[PDB]
Structure 1
């Protein structure tokens, strides 16, 4: 009843669906080590005085995508969306999954429709316990 084809000159899925330049550049060009860390180093972050960032700068508001790591393997896109939904409206959740293993490593990125809620999510749950594990959130 159904006919199948072997060789295909053009792709139907790629033509019909496409990914944004912002999500593609951040996810594809991310550092293999920075994407996931097992041991914490004091050299990267050090405690000092009350100042540091200053009056201007420090945090960016131009990006609406945030990094979220430290989740459980049994967590789905629905879980990440519904957990970060109280802060604002969310567009899409991406989880780097391999075709061979089809397994999750406990980290993903979140896309926020509003830039104000995005900055709110980072200031409220930057280092909080979710699903029984510690998570980290920052600008992507």
Structure 2
């Protein structure tokens, strides 16, 4: 295993089933170290997530253990993905997210950069 940086902030999670909630992400992410926040964004018409969420650790070292082990983990009968989410701090006050992992969140909305202005 390995990573681009250790970080000390929030980290990304994906490949989740819509049945996943913060209680599933907490029980699966707590064995490497203490967690302090978890939130799941939802689709406005169904109140379900598209298999993507966020998690925050109380320690920087235990967050590096999450990306090193949970990236091979499985939930609800399907594989999941985990990675850093610090190198995507939004440039709010100058522009919207279009230059990092936050750009693929826009590609996830459905391309959208063909109308960005």
TM-score tier (shorter): 0.5 to 0.7
Between the aligned partners of 1:67 and 1:91, the Cα distance in structure 2 is 15
Structure-1 separation of matches of 2:47 and 2:17? 15
Aligned-pair Cα RMSD in Å: 1.8
Cα displacement (A) at 1:94? 1.4
Q: Quote how far apart the aligned CAs of 1:99 are.
A: 3.8
Give the corresponding residue for 1:75: 20
TM-score, normalisation: structure 1: 0.54
Between the two proteins, the alignment pairs up a number of residues equal to: 84
Residue of structure 1 in register with 2:4 after alignment: 59
Alpha-carbon contact 2:38-2:54 (below 8 Å) kept: yes
> How far 1:137 sits from its partner (Å)?
0.4
Listed as ranges, the gaps of 5+ residues in structure 1 are 1-52
Deviation for aligned residue 1:133: 0.9
Q: Post-superposition, which runs of at least 4 consecutive aligned residues in structure 1 deviate over 4 A? A: none
Cross-structure match for 1:120: 65
Structure 2 unaligned spans of 5+:
86-117
Deviations 1:33-72 (Å, cap 9, x if unpaired)?
xxxxxxxxxxxxxxxxxxxx9xxxx522233311110111
1-side partners of 2:4 and 2:72: how far apart? Answer: 16
- Partner Cα distance (1:104, 1:61) in 2: 27
Q: Which has the higher relative contact order, 1 or 2, with Cα contacts under 8 A spaced 6 or more apart?
A: 2
Larger Rg belongs to:
1
Question: If the length of structure 2 is used for normalisation, what is the TM-score?
Answer: 0.64
Distance of 2:71 and 2:48 partners within structure 1: 25
- The alpha carbon displacement at 1:77 in A equals 0.7
